[PDB]
Write a protein that binds this ligand. Structure first.
Ligand SMILES: N[C@@H](CCSC[C@H]1O[C@@H](n2cnc3c(NCc4cccc(Cl)c4)ncnc32)[C@H](O)[C@@H]1O)C(=O)O
Length: 257
């Protein structure tokens, strides 16, 4: 090839575990989960986001990169961070989340946070087998990291192919697990011409993944954005651990819509 991303990946795989754990959060942003974790351990059902995902999606929404509305589909919902977040938003009328669950996979967590009544989370659902449904907002956070970039290329292309029939001039935010492999870039470019949007790096993502998100509201050069991330992540190998920038987690409140 060999792409910058592929060079990054080789370096990452060389790291000792100790080096890996220091590198993965070096200079990133993260929300302080202390209060939420404690609440959730005690079975508290209000205010707390169930995962770091609520803040991650919030970052895109507060920047208008995706603007959830009407019927929201959340593919690979896990515990439900994206779903519960969207459920509290003014333009949102219904949230449908699908996730695999079972061994190796997070189950949805029931909560009584704001707007929980327009929300249904369904486990036991492999979205590769789901036929597309009409939706006003399509979200997808699927993509499992692997030491092998060709395994990740395969997973990423599977996701891109799976999501396309759900895209019908709607709002969207889709995880692209490995955006640097050449075949992925071709698919993304084709998809961009057809459905628009842009690839964006979220500052809350760990340095241990090259994930970027395809969001509906933006434009830009995919190849440039991907290389920018590869250079960033590579540069973060060169210095001692920079402690992450710590921000407040989201308060999702209580009550119905
Ligand atoms: N955003 C969330 C955090 C969510 S993190 C991502 C979540 O997605 C779930 N998951 C993984 N593969 C899945 C699959 N098909 C398999 C598959 C694999 C690759 C490509 C395709 Cl098309 C299909 N079908 C359904 N769920 C899957 C996984 O258990 C995790 O909870 C939060 O805020 O909390």
């Amino acid at each position: 090839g060999e792409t910058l991303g592929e060079k990054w990946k080789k370096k990452l795989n060389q790291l000792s575990r100790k080096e890996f754990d220091l590198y993965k959060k070096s200079g990133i942003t993260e929300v302080d989960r202390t209060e939420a974790k404690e609440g959730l351990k005690r079975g508290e059902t209000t205010h707390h986001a169930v995962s770091r995902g609520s803040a991650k999606l919030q970052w895109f929404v507060e920047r208008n990169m995706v603007i959830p509305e009407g019927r929201v589909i959340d593919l690979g919902c896990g515990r439900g961070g994206w779903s519960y977040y969207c459920a509290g938003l003014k333009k949102v009328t219904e949230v449908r989340g699908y996730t695999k669950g079972g061994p190796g996979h997070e189950e949805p967590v029931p909560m009584s946070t704001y707007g929980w009544n327009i929300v249904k989370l369904m486990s036991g659902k492999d979205v590769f087998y789901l036929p597309p449904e009409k939706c006003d907002t399509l979200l997808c956070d699927i993509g499992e990291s692997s030491p092998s970039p060709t395994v990740e290329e395969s997973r990423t292309i599977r996701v891109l192919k799976m999501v396309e029939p759900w895209l019908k001039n709607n709002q969207f935010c889709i995880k692209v697990l490995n955006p640097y492999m050449p075949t992925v870039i071709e698919h993304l470019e084709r998809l961009q011409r057809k459905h628009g949007g842009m690839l964006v790096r979220n500052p809350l993502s760990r340095n241990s993944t090259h994930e970027m998100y395809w969001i509906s509201n933006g434009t830009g050069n995919i190849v440039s954005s991907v290389n920018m991330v590869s250079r960033l992540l590579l540069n973060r190998f060169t210095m001692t651990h920079r402690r992450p920038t710590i921000e407040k987690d989201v308060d999702l409140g209580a009550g119905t819509r």
